Nucleic acid binder design. Sequence first.
DNA 1: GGTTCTAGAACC
DNA 2: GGTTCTAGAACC
Lengths: 94, 94
Amino acid sequence: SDFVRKLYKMLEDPSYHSVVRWSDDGDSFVVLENEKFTKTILPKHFKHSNFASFVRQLNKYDFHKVRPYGRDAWEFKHPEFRADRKDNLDNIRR
Amino acid sequence: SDFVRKLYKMLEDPSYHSVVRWSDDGDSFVVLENEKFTKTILPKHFKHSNFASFVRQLNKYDFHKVRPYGRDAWEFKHPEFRADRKDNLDNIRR
DNA sequence: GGTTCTAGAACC
DNA sequence: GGTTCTAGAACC
């Protein structure tokens, strides 16, 4: 899955650690500081700089938001998207 | 309509001119610089600091986005929401 | 009603 | 398929 690969690789990079990273556990990820993520990182990895479209893709492939870390921190979770479970990436789709 | 009133009054204020204002015509409005609008102005007038919820309300009361001004500029339009047509505000609902 | 999360539909 | 606009549903 193209999206999941790009998502994982985005999280594989410590350059972004401050604004996008894995949750301490490693079973969810956090996006925080929408200024720099939306305007700088989204367009690096994707074809837009629009957070709502990033969110849509996450719901499209069966991520859910978690109901923190920073102030404007968004946390999403898929049961099969984890820091160590790197093989399960084509095992996530819709 | 509570939303429309608050929307109009938000646009009635030149403090915000740089980040939220009427379109030159006066028949649509522009929101631009999501940093300052979302984090500073949304919470002044509404019960959140979440742009997507602002967008939802606009679609709920029959505003549409226009397909510019700045870079991350969002423009919305209702036929009956205009700078001079201030009386038509309860004539907008859903 | 307003806010939040998720999804439909349509265009690219 | 991905992106964009709009809307459904549910909780507050």
